[PDB]
Design a protein around this ligand. Structure first.
Ligand SMILES: CCCCCCCCCCCCCCCCCC(=O)OC[C@H](CO[C@@H]1O[C@H](CO[C@H]2O[C@H](CO)[C@H](O)[C@H](O)[C@H]2O)[C@H](O)[C@H](O)[C@H]1O)OC(=O)CCCCCCCCCCCCCCCCC
Ligand code: CLA
Ligand code: CLA
Ligand code: CLA
Ligand code: CLA
Ligand code: CLA
Ligand SMILES: CCCCCCCCCCCCCCCCCC(=O)OC[C@H](CO[C@@H]1O[C@H](CO)[C@H](O)[C@H](O)[C@H]1O)OC(=O)CCCCCCCCCCCCCCCCC
Ligand SMILES: CCCCCCCCCCCCCCCC(=O)OC[C@H](COP(=O)(O)OC[C@@H](O)CO)OC(=O)CCCCCCCCCCCCCCC
Ligand SMILES: CC1=C(/C=C/C(C)=C/C=C/C(C)=C/C=C/C=C(C)/C=C/C=C(C)/C=C/C2=C(C)CCCC2(C)C)C(C)(C)CCC1
Ligand SMILES: CC1=C(/C=C/C(C)=C/C=C/C(C)=C/C=C/C=C(C)/C=C/C=C(C)/C=C/C2=C(C)CCCC2(C)C)C(C)(C)CCC1
Ligand SMILES: CC1=C(/C=C/C(C)=C/C=C/C(C)=C/C=C/C=C(C)/C=C/C=C(C)/C=C/C2=C(C)CCCC2(C)C)C(C)(C)CCC1
Ligand SMILES: CCCCCCCS[C@@H]1O[C@H](CO)[C@@H](O)[C@H](O)[C@H]1O
Ligand SMILES: [Ca+2]
Ligand SMILES: [Cl-]
Ligand SMILES: [Cl-]
Ligand SMILES: [Fe+2]
Ligand SMILES: [Mg+2]
Lengths: 79, 40, 342, 63, 31, 36, 501, 34, 32, 38, 172, 34
């Protein structure tokens, strides 16, 4: 019932739309990482946030129900 | 801007798209050797 | 005059490019969330707080090393729902705790249910017998036993496979070292069915392609076939004679041939699932008792079986401290099993 | 076919093969019971799982 | 006893191969 | 008077050979574990 | 003719012979239960519920008899260790005999139904064709099921007319069959609360009676009758198999995790009790409380019941077995005889050291001793040339408190090391390894075997559900597809499989 | 080798019982009016 | 506007894909 | 008492009901607009 | 070795010595044999799904095909109609010759690559090595799943042929 | 009782081998044209 992708993607209308939305989405994803927002949304350490300066033991979660607080505490221990 | 198919030949779309892929994947490989993940 | 249910039914079952169906109501969201959860976690999400591991492109991993990792052992078999008592609605904390693991496992399970319902729904609509759905029971048995039953028998989800290339390879090696899984006859039947299935796939496709009738003038022979033709496109009689003379036996019945193609790999996967259900309980084929009694009494008696357990013992001692961080293992240099020099 | 004393007594219980209520009948009510059943199963699972923790419900051998 | 058992089973399998090949149900074109 | 639900049963020669192959190969696989 | 895998299909349209096959199945199952119990009674040693309970002996049916109140033998003993009891008829032997007799009556009933298959009851009065009114059968059976469920909860489990059920303290030390009152608050849904089992049966039973009455009195909607093919008995097979694989998964789960219906004196301890050091904690609690009340170390440990120490031992953990290591747990480590007492390890300085215990995952495990802060103080080296922590270098000794070896101290390093190897397994026992020619290799308990068989069967029963569901929903195409090319090809129909579009 | 003393009976019956089931079925198929 | 099931399907996949590829591209320039 | 995890449970249930309710309302609405003539 | 446990010995030592799991040709091998098995089951179920009715309920459908008959025994159009809707139309084969070619090519190519994996690891060009590839701002190694693989491989390495090595490197 | 360990398998096959011989012959007799 609908048009073949090969018609749609060889049309000017398609390229006019997508020459703008493709770069736009690409640049939004670039900035998501380049501004560091990706770190904070997901809670992923930056290269300087795996360990506090002197320690070498990993912040493993050890308590099911205050795992949330344990992580909060580990995060404060990075000064 | 017509919806008519065939105006931008399929062979050129496929060439340009494929070149785009080679570029993005090549950048990924370059990153295997620089910055994070590079072992250095 | 027509009821809303019938009107919804019509719309669900319209012939469109992507068939939807009632099954689609379950399949599409769950399959989308499982796949999207995997892409998201492997791109952005760490395993530092659950495993002490980097596991995302963002941290520097590559396609082979990224994973969505299982939660910490301390989480037990918690559903780890976003709104649950561990994460308590906090999306960031949820990711750090391993909530994307159960997200992906559970949505992936409901999505597999939807896909098999889809196989049924389409078969009923088009009017074919639903063997394809029946064949899909094997992937389902493998998924459920490995991703759900297995960790449910163990201490926690931590010991389920993590979703990633290298993480899965780690899972293989864990099963060798701790379960001696290669010794298990249920695994061996699984092996036979997968390798047997790949054998049949290859040999059948090659036999058809080399007993084709000449139905065109082209040297490239694909054009000389029509979907609607009444006639078989290759000779069953010549193929039967060839294999009878080469291998001693041959198929003569096309329906049996195709049923057997379903049977072999489907049965193999089902048998492997059974063994993994045993491993959930540590009910391994780890040892042969007669071997161990003889070897204990006779220090000159050696087999490939005893040689493999020495490798397993190496694997457990060398991998366990980093692989099971919640145990806090410290194995002094002097206690590590090692052969000479190495 | 063989009639028997007990068979005669039981006859009415096997006499309405194929009989239906028109259209959807009590399907809507059934749906509601099914939904409540699903919610009950979710509750007992989450209690066993310690995803739902209730006052005075210590899910342990020990109280 | 175990060795006998394994060799017995193996021997039966080879015997089966012989019957399956030389005493098969012969393929016949319904003709 | 006879039960009209009765039916003949069959096992053709190829199925005998397939079956005996299954049984003997499963015995060849499992016997080691039985002896242990 | 019929292929071998379809021979039983001859029953589909023959209600009387289907009943005969069901009767024969039932005779076989009941014969199994009677046979199994007699074999267990012929092999069971009732003389030590402390260190040789049923779950150490490979008993599978005996705990199910005990769970519901059969605790006594005609020969005078009870499973709690009593002498001089009169269990009446319902001893373990009476239960076995009753199942054997049932089996025989069922068998005779099967024969009768097989021969006299052509009952007028099995025919549709109107059409004279064999007919079963499945929707109404469902109401009748559900109602009977409800009555029996209700009665089971309200009379048997309460003790109101019946013996009650097995209950125990949280450490499985003092188990016995007791009347249990229903629990009607939210703790009724706690799996470890036995009053919830009682309230379940009362409440779910009343609900089965009500719904069975419904299903007796109200016909299925035409829409559901058609969609679920309620004239096709194979529809019932399909959904019944689903219900059963659901139940089978549930019982595997509560067997593995533990519940009030899977008590540890009947099935053995769970693997999670080892994982969480559940018994070690309670042992250390008691010992600490004795020391605080003024006990010597000897007295504190001597007050620990042998049965409590024995739970805190890995050879009783059901996650330490093997699929082909067959038989009773006693066949591996041996028949437990006596607690040796609690081993305390100390180095030359007199500091107390603790042997790192084996996690269930490991078939073998090194010997490593740490101080109370987790710092490694001694071990048994593999390579010796660079050993720093040897028992010999560190002057490790062991002293026992409580049990056989109370008050003894060993200093000979091979001896101290042998006890340290035992300590990785938890508390240390003396075993008889001769009586059964025990081979020293751990086996699982009935807890482990039950879980395994039921998880496996549940999974296989998923296939059976899918298979019979398909056969029900595609009955028309079971022999193949129609000998309309426009219904499978694209473009022709607006809505798939509908020619009216 | 100190093998399990029931391994021989288990293997023999494992082989014999299903094989005999198939032989019974095959021979009574052959003897049917062809 | 008139959307189709196919169009929705296409964009649920395509749109995040591009966004993610932009993210991953940027990550190739992170130094520790 | 309504513990934190029981409130969490209710949040989970409402969430699921909303997702399902919205999904079905939307699908019913669409099917009623966009109908198969016969 | 020519034996079942000896084969497993070979595989484990090979992992220790070549990290074959991390080698893309062994990865292609796996794709070939898992894919072979998937497509075997797929094709079998599709053809079986669409057998033309030629038999009664009490007979095996296999009796609906006679050795050497001219007509196809199943409806490939119907098979295609199902599979094309299962995925989308063009994901499905309706040229049986293209189909059977694919069935041949997929496991055969994959398994060629498996063979070439072993045959090139034979000259010690080994699996990918990301051991300590991820390092933090200070220089601390942040382990990945590769490093956990490496700890399992070490165990196999140090234990194999426990009496055979006198010098520190296993160089063959 | 210290019985001969081969007693069981000797007894089992003594029963099974000729019983199955007879069953095979009986069933294929019944399946011959009425
Ligand atoms: C095929 C069909 C297609 C279907 C695919 C569809 C997928 C649907 C999704 C289902 C998801 C089910 C999640 C079950 C989670 C679970 O179980 O979670 C487990 C919890 C039990 O919790 C665990 O309990 C353990 C034991 O604790 C107990 O013992 C401890 C030690 O003494 C303490 O005393 C503690 O307080 C006491 O509670 C530990 O605490 C663990 O850390 C903890 O995770 O039980 C529970 O929620 C429920 C237990 C009973 C129900 C089990 C039914 C389902 C599982 C069947 C498989 C069985 C596995 C056996 C292995 C073989
Ligand atoms: C068919 C579609 C579908 C299905 C089957 C699932 C299933 C699941 N989801 Mg996913 N989800 C979906 C679509 C789906 N989701 C979509 C479209 C989104 C984006 C909006 C999500 C986003 C999402 C998140 C963020 C999470 C889940 C999670 C879950 C899991 C727990 C869900 C739960 O407890 O619901 C409980 C709710 C119900 C069972 C609905 C009950 C409906 C009943 C029958 C009616 C009751 C209504 C009642 C009268 C009103 C409420 C009472 C009041 C007191 C509030 C389960 C695997 C969780 C998980 O994976 O954690 C690991 C999780 O964190 N989902
Ligand atoms: C006050 C009234 C009352 C009370 C106190 C109880 C108390 C109980 N009921 Mg009963 N019940 C009642 C009324 C009551 N019930 C009524 C009116 C009905 C309707 C007839 C029921 C129907 C019912 C069912 C159907 C079940 C209970 C169960 C229980 C127990 C829950 C604790 C447990 O061990 O769950 C353990 C069970 C669960 C936590 C449910 C697991 C649900 C699974 C996960 C669904 C998915 C299954 C799928 C096949 C899994 C495949 C994937 C997997 C392999 C990974 C407990 C004895 C459960 C029980 O029997 O436990 C032994 C149970 O299954 N009840
Ligand atoms: C639910 C089923 C069940 C369970 C959980 C148990 C549990 C137990 N029994 Mg009981 N038993 C059962 C049913 C069960 N039994 C039945 C039906 C019988 C009659 C045969 C017995 C007769 C029996 C005796 C005579 C004895 C026990 C004993 C035991 C204990 C040791 C069990 C053991 O060693 O297993 C070992 C289990 C295995 C080695 C697993 C076998 C796996 C099979 C062989 C796999 C076959 C695969 C298949 C062929 C593949 C086909 C592939 C094809 C489809 C392609 C344990 C408490 C022992 C005990 O200690 O008693 C006090 C004991 O002496 N049992
Ligand atoms: C209550 C459960 C139940 C019942 C009543 C049935 C009944 C039926 N099945 Mg279904 N089925 C089930 C569960 C069940 N099945 C399960 C769990 C599975 C997956 C394993 C299947 C998979 C299945 C398939 C694939 C097929 C059937 C077929 C049939 C029909 C013919 C059966 C026959 O002649 O076998 C005759 C069987 C033999 C002569 C020998 C079987 C020997 C087995 C493999 C090993 C021995 C088992 C042992 C003796 C018993 C212990 C059982 C216990 C542990 C549970 C019949 C209506 C067939 C069909 O649809 O016909 C039209 C068919 O093709 N079944
Ligand atoms: C792969 C999974 C699978 C598949 C493909 C089928 C397929 C089939 N089923 Mg079976 N079934 C299943 C599993 C499955 N079933 C399970 C697990 C159960 C529970 C024991 C059943 C119970 C069952 C019955 C009782 C019947 C069927 C029937 C059928 C047939 C008709 C379609 C149907 O009713 O679907 C049923 C629909 C589903 C399986 C989809 C369920 C989706 C749920 C509601 C999502 C729940 C989300 C959850 C609340 C999220 C929270 C998660 C929590 C862990 C946090 C068909 C053969 C019928 C039949 O045979 O007709 C002839 C029939 O009577 N099914
Ligand atoms: C338009 C519609 C498209 C829909 C697609 C949505 C479905 C998911 C598609 C599959 C994606 C899975 C691969 C992602 C790989 C990736 O992003 O790597 C991204 C990584 C990024 O590269 C890493 O980046 C880090 C950033 O800190 C560091 O620099 C690392 O050193 C560097 O390796 O690239 C690589 O690893 C090298 C290229 C790897 C590509 C191999 C793909 C093989 C996949 C085969 C199996 C799936 C088949 C899918 C078919 C489609
Ligand atoms: C190159 C080898 C791989 C493709 C074919 C070989 C497998 C043989 C299987 C057994 C015989 C199977 C058999 O009998 O095939 C027969 C089949 C058709 O036979 P025809 O006679 O019609 O065509 C072959 C010649 O006669 C030319 O017309 O052969 C082909 O289709 C060859 C196509 C070559 C296409 C060029 C090479 C493309 C490579 C494929 C993509 C690989 C990419 C790798 C990515 C990881
Ligand atoms: C189409 C297509 C596609 C794509 C493709 C592509 C993307 C391609 C590309 C291509 C390309 C892109 C090409 C290029 C080429 C080039 C060339 C070939 C060049 C040459 C040059 C030279 C030779 C030079 C030389 C020199 C010297 C030597 C010195 C100095 C000077 C000079 C520089 C001159 C695909 C597959 C998707 C699909 C199908 C179709
Ligand atoms: C989780 C979650 C969610 C969801 C999400 C999602 C849904 C997402 C999606 C996402 C996505 C959807 C993404 C995508 C991505 C993609 C990518 C990243 C791609 C890449 C690719 C590439 C790179 C390519 C490659 C290749 C291949 C594959 C083969 C051929 C060759 C080449 C090389 C080209 C929600 C919110 C509900 C909630 C919470 C959680
Ligand atoms: C007639 C009569 C009588 C008698 C009765 C009797 C004496 C009975 C007995 C009965 C019995 C005495 C029975 C038994 C049964 C058994 C069974 C039925 C078994 C089965 C088994 C099975 C099925 C198994 C399987 C298996 C195996 C073998 C291996 C492993 C795996 C499984 C578990 C699967 C009287 C005088 C009372 C009166 C009336 C008449
Ligand atoms: C999507 C949930 C499935 C539940 C099926 C219920 C459809 S029942 C509903 O009932 C009305 C009154 O009887 C009818 O008029 C109407 O046509 C029908 O759609
Ligand atoms: Ca001995
Ligand atoms: Cl070696
Ligand atoms: Cl050397
Ligand atoms: Fe084919
Ligand atoms: Mg980089």
């Amino acid at each position: 019932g609908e048009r073949p992708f090969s018609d749609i993607i060889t049309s000017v209308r398609y390229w006019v739309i997508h020459s703008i939305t493709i770069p736009a989405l690409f640049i939004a994803g670039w900035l998501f990482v380049s501004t560091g927002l990706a770190y904070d949304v997901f809670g992923t350490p930056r290269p300087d946030s795996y360990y506090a300066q002197e320690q070498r033991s990993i912040p493993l979660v050890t308590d099911r129900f205050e795992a949330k607080q344990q992580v909060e505490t580990f995060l404060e221990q990075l000064k | 801007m017509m919806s008519e198919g065939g105006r931008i030949p399929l062979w050129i779309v496929a060439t340009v798209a494929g070149m785009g892929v080679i570029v993005i994947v090549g950048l990924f490989f370059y990153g295997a050797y620089a910055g994070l993940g590079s072992s250095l | 005059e027509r009821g809303w249910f019938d009107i919804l039914d019509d719309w669900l079952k319209r012939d469109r490019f992507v068939f939807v169906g009632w099954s689609g109501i379950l399949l599409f969201p769950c399959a989308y969330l499982a796949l999207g959860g995997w892409l998201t976690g492997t791109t952005f999400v760490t395993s530092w707080y659950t495993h002490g591991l980097a596991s995302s492109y963002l941290e520097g991993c590559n396609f082979l090393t990224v994973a969505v990792s299982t939660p910490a052992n301390s989480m037990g078999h918690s559903l780890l729902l976003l709104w649950g008592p561990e994460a308590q609605g906090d999306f960031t904390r949820w990711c750090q705790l391993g909530g994307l693991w159960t997200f992906i496992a559970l949505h992936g399970a409901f999505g597999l249910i939807g896909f098999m319902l889809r196989q049924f729904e389409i078969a009923r609509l088009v009017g074919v017998r639903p063997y394809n759905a029946i064949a899909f029971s094997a992937p389902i048995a493998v998924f459920v036993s490995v991703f759900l039953i297995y960790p449910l028998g163990q201490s926690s989800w931590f010991f389920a496979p993590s979703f990633g290339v290298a993480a899965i390879f780690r899972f293989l090696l864990f099963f060798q070292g701790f379960h001696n899984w290669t010794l298990n006859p249920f695994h061996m039947m699984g092996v036979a069915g997968v390798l047997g299935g790949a054998l049949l796939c290859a040999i059948h496709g090659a036999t058809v392609e080399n007993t084709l009738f000449q139905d065109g003038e082209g040297a490239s022979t694909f054009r000389a076939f029509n979907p609607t033709q009444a006639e078989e496109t290759y000779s069953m009689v010549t193929a039967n004679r060839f294999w009878s003379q080469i291998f001693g036996i041959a198929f003569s019945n096309k329906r049996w041939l195709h049923f057997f193609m379903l049977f072999v790999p489907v049965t193999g996967l089902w048998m492997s699932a059974i063994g993994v259900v045993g491993l959930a309980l540590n009910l391994r084929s780890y040892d042969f008792i007669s071997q161990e009694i003889r070897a204990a009494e006779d220090p000159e008696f050696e087999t490939f079986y005893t040689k493999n357990l020495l490798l397993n013992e190496g694997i457990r001692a060398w991998m366990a401290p980093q692989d099971q961080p919640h145990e806090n293992f410290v194995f002094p240099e002097e206690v590590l099993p090692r052969g000479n020099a190495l | 076919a063989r009639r028997t004393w007990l068979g005669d007594i039981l006859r009415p219980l096997n006499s309405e093969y194929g009989k239906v209520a028109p259209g959807w009948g009590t399907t809507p009510l059934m749906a509601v019971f099914m939904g409540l059943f699903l919610v009950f199963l979710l509750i007992i699972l989450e209690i066993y799982n310690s995803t739902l923790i209730l006052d005075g419900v210590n899910v342990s051998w020990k109280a | 006893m175990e060795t006998i058992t394994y060799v017995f089973i193996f021997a039966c399998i080879i015997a089966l191969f012989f019957f399956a090949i030389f005493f098969r149900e012969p393929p016949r074109i319904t003709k | 008077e006879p039960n009209p639900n009765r039916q003949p049963v069959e096992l053709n020669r190829t199925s005998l050979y397939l079956g005996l192959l299954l049984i003997l190969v499963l015995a060849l696989l499992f016997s080691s574990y039985f002896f242990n | 003719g019929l292929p071998w895998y379809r021979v039983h299909t001859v029953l589909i349209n023959d209600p009387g012979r289907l009943i005969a096959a069901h009767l024969m199945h039932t005779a076989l199952v009941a014969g199994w239960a009677g046979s199994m119990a007699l074999y267990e009674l012929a092999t069971f040693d009732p003389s030590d519920p402390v260190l040789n309970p049923m779950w150490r002996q490979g008993m599978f049916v005996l705990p199910f008899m005990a769970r519901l109140g059969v605790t006594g033998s005609w020969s005078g003993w009870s499973i709690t260790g009593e002498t001089g009891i009169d269990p009446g008829f319902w001893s373990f032997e009476g239960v076995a005999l009753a199942h054997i007799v049932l089996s025989g009556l069922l068998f005779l009933a099967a024969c009768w139904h097989w021969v006299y298959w052509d009952l007028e009851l099995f025919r549709d009065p109107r059409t004279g064709e064999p007919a079963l009114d499945l929707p109404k059968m469902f109401g009748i059976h559900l109602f009977l099921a409800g009555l029996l469920c209700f009665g089971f909860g309200a009379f048997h489990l309460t003790g109101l007319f019946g013996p009650g059920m097995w209950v125990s303290d949280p450490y499985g030390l003092t188990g016995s069959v007791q009347p249990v009152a229903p629990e009607w608050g939210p703790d009724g849904f706690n799996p470890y609360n036995p009053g919830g089992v009682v309230a379940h049966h009362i409440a779910a039973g009343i609900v089965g009676i009500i719904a069975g009455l419904f299903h007796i009195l109200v016909r299925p909607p035409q829409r559901l009758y058609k969609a679920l093919r309620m004239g096709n008995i194979e529809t019932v097979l399909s959904s019944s198999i689903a219900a059963v694989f659901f139940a089978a998964f549930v019982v595997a789960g509560t067997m593995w995790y533990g519940s009030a219906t899977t008590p540890i004196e009947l099935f053995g301890p769970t693997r999670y009790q080892w994982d969480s050091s559940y018994f070690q904690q309670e042992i250390n609690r008691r010992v600490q409380a004795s020391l605080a009340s003024g006990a010597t170390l000897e007295e504190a440990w001597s007050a620990i019941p042998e049965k409590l120490a024995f739970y805190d031992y890995i050879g009783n953990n059901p996650a330490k077995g093997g699929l082909f290591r067959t038989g009773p747990m006693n066949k591996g480590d041996g028949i437990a005889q006596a607690w040796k007492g609690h081993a305390v390890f100390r180095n030359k300085e007199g500091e107390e050291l603790f042997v790192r215990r084996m996690p269930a995952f490991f078939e073998s495990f090194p010997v490593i001793l740490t101080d109370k802060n987790g710092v490694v103080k001694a071990d048994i080296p593999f390579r010796r040339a660079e050993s720093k922590y040897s028992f010999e270098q560190q002057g490790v000794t062991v002293s026992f408190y409580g049990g056989e070896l109370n008050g003894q101290t060993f200093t000979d390093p091979p001896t101290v090391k042998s006890y340290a190897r035992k300590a990785i397994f938890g508390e240390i026992f003396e075993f008889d390894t001769e009586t059964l020619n025990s081979d020293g290799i751990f086996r699982t308990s009935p807890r482990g075997w039950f879980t395994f068989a039921h998880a496996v069967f549940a999974l296989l029963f998923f296939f059976g559900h899918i298979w019979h569901g398909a056969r029900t929903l595609f009955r028309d195409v079971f022999s193949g597809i129609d000998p309309s090319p426009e219904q499978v090809e694209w473009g022709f129909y607006q809505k798939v499989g509908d020619v009216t579009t | 080798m100190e093998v399990n003393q029931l391994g021989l009976i288990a293997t023999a019956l494992f082989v014999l019982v299903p094989s005999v089931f198939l032989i019974i079925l095959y021979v009574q198929t052959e003897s049917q009016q062809k | 506007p008139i959307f189709t099931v196919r169009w929705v399907a296409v964009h649920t996949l395509a749109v995040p894909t591009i966004f993610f590829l932009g993210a991953i591209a940027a990550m190739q320039f992170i130094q520790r | 008492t309504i513990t934190p995890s029981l409130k969490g449970f209710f949040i989970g249930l409402l969430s699921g009901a909303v997702v399902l309710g919205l999904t079905f309302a939307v699908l019913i609405a669409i099917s009623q607009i966009d109908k198969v003539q016969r | 070795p020519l034996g079942i446990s000896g084969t497993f010995n070979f595989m484990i030592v090979f992992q220790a010595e070549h990290n074959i799991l991390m080698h893309p040709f062994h990865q292609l091998g796996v794709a070939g044999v898992f894919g072979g098995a998937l497509f075997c089951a797929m094709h079998g179920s599709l053809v079986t799904s669409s057998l033309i009715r030629e038999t009664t309920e009490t007979e095996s459908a296999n009796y609906g095909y006679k050795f050497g008959q001219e007509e196809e025994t199943y409806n490939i159009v119907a098979a295609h109609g199902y599979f094309g809707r299962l995925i989308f139309q063009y994901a499905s084969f309706n040229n049986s010759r293209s189909l059977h070619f694919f069935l041949a090519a997929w496991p055969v190519v994959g398994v060629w690559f498996a063979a070439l994996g072993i045959s090139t690891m034979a000259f010690n060009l080994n699996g990918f090595n990301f051991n300590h590839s991820v390092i933090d701002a200070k220089g601390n190694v942040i382990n990945t799943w590769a490093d956990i693989i490496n700890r399992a491989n070490l165990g196999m390495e140090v234990m194999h042929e426990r009496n055979a090595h006198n010098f520190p490197l296993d160089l063959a």
